[PDB]
Design a protein around this nucleic acid. Sequence first.
RNA 1: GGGCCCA
RNA 2: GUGGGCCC
Lengths: 801, 62, 114, 31
Amino acid sequence: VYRAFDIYVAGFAKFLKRLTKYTMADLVYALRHFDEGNCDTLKEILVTYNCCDDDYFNKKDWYDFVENPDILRVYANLGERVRQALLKTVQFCDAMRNAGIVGVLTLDNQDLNGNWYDFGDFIQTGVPVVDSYYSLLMPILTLTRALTAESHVDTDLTKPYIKWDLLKYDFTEERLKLFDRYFKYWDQTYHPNCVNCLDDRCILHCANFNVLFSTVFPPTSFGPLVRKIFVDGVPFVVSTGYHFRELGVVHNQDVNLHSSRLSFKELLVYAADPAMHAASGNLLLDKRTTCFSVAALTNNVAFQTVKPGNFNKDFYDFAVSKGFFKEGSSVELKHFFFAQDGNAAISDYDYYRYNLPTMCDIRQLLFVVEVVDKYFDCYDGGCINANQVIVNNLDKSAGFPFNKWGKARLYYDSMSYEDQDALFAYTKRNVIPTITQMNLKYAISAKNRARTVAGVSICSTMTNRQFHQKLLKSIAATRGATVVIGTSKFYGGWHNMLKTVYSDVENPHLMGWDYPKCDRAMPNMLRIMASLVLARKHTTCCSLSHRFYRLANECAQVLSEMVMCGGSLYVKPGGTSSGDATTAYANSVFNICQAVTANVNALLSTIADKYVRNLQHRLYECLYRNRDVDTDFVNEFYAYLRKHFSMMILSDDAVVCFNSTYASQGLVASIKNFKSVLYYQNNVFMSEAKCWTETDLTKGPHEFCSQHTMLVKQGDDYVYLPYPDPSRILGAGCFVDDIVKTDGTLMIERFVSLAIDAYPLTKHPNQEYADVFHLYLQYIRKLHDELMLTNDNTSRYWEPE
Amino acid sequence: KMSDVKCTSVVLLSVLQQLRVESSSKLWAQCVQLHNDILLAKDTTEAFEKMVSLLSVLLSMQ
Amino acid sequence: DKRAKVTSAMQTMLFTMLRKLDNDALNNIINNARDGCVPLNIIPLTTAAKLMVVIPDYNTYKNTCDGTTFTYASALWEIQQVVDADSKIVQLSEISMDNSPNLAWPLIVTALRA
Amino acid sequence: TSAMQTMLFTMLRKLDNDALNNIINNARDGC
RNA sequence: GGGCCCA
RNA sequence: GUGGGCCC
Ligand SMILES: [Mg+2]
Ligand SMILES: [Zn+2]
Ligand SMILES: [Zn+2]
């Protein structure tokens, strides 16, 4: 029956065919096309080695990495069966190299046991090429922490922990140990101290090896590195190094063991720096978190609570008087201000527990960024200056101690262009980690979570805003594009966008879909490649080492910084900081990365049209067998996409006009691949129940940015009109976060802002869907008694000027 | 009368917050669990049951 | 110029930190290893004249603070003072499997090294 | 927030469920 | 400058 | 706290 093979036909999928009846290939194969319900050999090789009992899967959420995190257990069960085959594979590369046998390698010959036979199309002579082997079995290696072996003394499972000494930091020898243990024959480079990397492409390369080469070593090892220092006499101690688990060692090359007349900026370095605050206070430990902890600032643990919703009863009467909120009516009320107790903070901070490192399967990211280049060859960036940033929104926070005194306004106004740019210059040599504060939200909504928010220090983001804010703005107003950031719906712009996304999709139908728990499950590597990609425009203002040190200083600023949950010191394995300057754009990039993954492992485990076959074949022999940044296969694919699978994007909202044929063949996107992917690449299950698929372009999209869509008449021909959910405006008008509490001045703007939102219901068949609008009209006139008062403009907002 | 009494539960837990229940932890935990369950109402007999429970504690105090 | 204002504030901060920094242990362990650089995970771990254990329940405080003194990962500690997630004093006597449901089950347990 | 108590009072009086109203009567006696 | 909606 | 449309 079907055995899953990597064929070299050139790809990897199912094929109808002392040993094991299943192979490591069958294993990773069911790992990596998880079709829930159709998830067989996954479980087969789990239960085969007493990793989990099938009766435990009669429970819900067994295959949720977000509820029931016990699957950590089920999967870390098989860790040494992973490890053993990796080492087998290096010793096999040996026993080929000194055997004089040059043929390329594959796992179907490799047993679940790990071992090998069947040397059939091998040339006799070497360099036995793994690259498929690891380009296969790379990301699934943190999926168990398979190399937990090396953390024991004598790297044996049945032993105490190695007490590594509690002062060391380097371990580069050991990093190379795991490399040439596992990567002796790795025919491409290595730079576990990645300032030695070739370029940003090799940065992604080697720090994607510091991931695996940092699972095993303890928390005592990593983090900032501290030395004693002397200004104006007296001692201090400062993190004048940092050990990233991805970037390895880094030494601030600009140090001052002795100093005098320290500077403003130098205090901007040494104020929010960690150790000054850390070792200068007490200790702390809470059994609440699974997270490692370090410390306390103040010597009392703290708690904070919620003040639940307001109520707006005048309007409540004004509605229900006319028979709103009636029995049998689909005018119910749903959305409200929940309230939460003091355990909230730690009880979502815990959900960082679902984080886990990835091995971004490296050549595939490398080619995908070879793809995204031309999504942005239409766009342009580069370093810029303090005095040519388009900054807004400056009345805002600036960091942990910097909370205590002022606003970001001060720091944009105080730190001169001299100041902020000299900082920009220091930061591209060195590394200064800082503090993030996790807070909570007062969003009227429907479900009962809290969805924590993050805030970082202004030192980080001010550099970051000087850095990337030319590329964004090249896209913040590029209309007719793929993206829509800056592209409103209004004035029928949504309409022409729909016509644009269509523009000869062949067998066109619409699909849409959304991410559960991205801000916690975010594999940090993807954040790395994004902040790199977002800087390829600096090719006249950044050298390559400066690129590495940029990358590192941001990865310490916001990604793996130290978290202050209450008065409690921790560190963050990862997860986006939702207050970051580049959240939505980075996540957009994230979205296309997912998009192409769908394209590809659609097109990999899936062909007769030889346009398609040559396109996947030269995929295979672009990735599995080739390396180079090449524009031609790139643009072949790229226009193929833009013809046949044409798209628009906002940060998770992935709207897709696409071809049913190719989508029905295994070329292009369907939800199932994404579900599988984030189940094997982002640590989540994406249930199609929240996704949708409209098979009629005439009927507009079910979802986008909290909007559905319909089809009506406009000026002698029919058009698509978007329209909102009434329950949202109902709740938000009926429930306020202490806004109309202040005056009635502002709330005019409140209700009318809500009111324009849903004029398209006036165009829709149901009556009280319409009298949503008529209620609002009469309420608006009820207010104009005290004070668009009519529907005058509310129609002209879909007649483009 | 399911919408209306959900609104009732909400104002009830509001004024409950107004009088410092959070200071006595599990008291706040109970009331919060009650209301987070009350807004999920489908059968109203349970809603009335949970109402009278949430009432018992307002009534308990002076 | 609030630049100078926050500047004054943060210099007062970073100066007043030293009121508990010059321990003489700091030098006693910088002079242990080479080139004056080690992590920050373990710095106020081992300058430690204090330890605060925040537990959830009674099952934890039992298996954690067994007695009035214990050891914290191969190093000894003396139990001084305890409170119970809302800062009302408790005793080892009161903390038992009997009167578990009159606790704010979590406990802040400050113990001191010998 | 003074009107909050009053409007909840009228709210409950409108709810017109037997148990709630009997216990309001129980409460009017401070019982 | 204020604020609604959205990621 | 982030960037994005809207309006005042
Ligand atoms: Mg969506
Ligand atoms: Zn390198
Ligand atoms: Zn540059």
